[PDB]
């Protein structure tokens, strides 16, 4: 009946200054700001969830407009609690500075 996923923002791709590697997103998870506070989230499933004109299927449900690109928080990225993610398809760029849901449910708790 409530929220079962931690809020995070899609900060941008893994990139040096002048070469962006679009196959490896960066995720700023909410409330976590240390390469320390982030062992929880490693290996967690994560979704970029976005709706679009045409209808689709839906597991355990009637057809919907919403779609998701699934992913997986692989590892921590640099000191201040940023994390790397890897999605079964690369993320749109449209999606920068928007919500991606990090689930709880490859839990090691």
């Amino acid at each position: 009946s409530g929220r079962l996923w931690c809020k995070a923002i899609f900060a941008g791709y893994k990139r040096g200054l002048r070469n962006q590697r679009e196959h490896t997103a960066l995720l700023k998870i909410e409330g976590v700001y240390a390469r320390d506070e982030t062992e929880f989230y490693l290996g967690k499933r994560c979704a970029y969830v976005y709706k679009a004109k045409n209808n689709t299927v839906t597991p355990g449900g009637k057809p919907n407009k919403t779609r998701v690109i699934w992913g997986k928080v692989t590892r921590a990225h640099g000191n201040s609690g940023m994390v790397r993610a890897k999605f079964r398809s690369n993320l749109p760029a449209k999606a920068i500075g928007h919500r991606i849901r990090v689930m709880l449910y490859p839990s090691r708790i």
Binding site: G2, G31, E37, T38
Partner: peptide, 16 residues
């Protein structure tokens, strides 16, 4: 009751 995350509570922080 049912479990859920609300504002200002973060899985990594809290314990269960």
């Amino acid at each position: 009751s049912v479990f859920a995350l609300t504002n200002g509570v973060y899985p990594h922080k809290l314990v269960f």
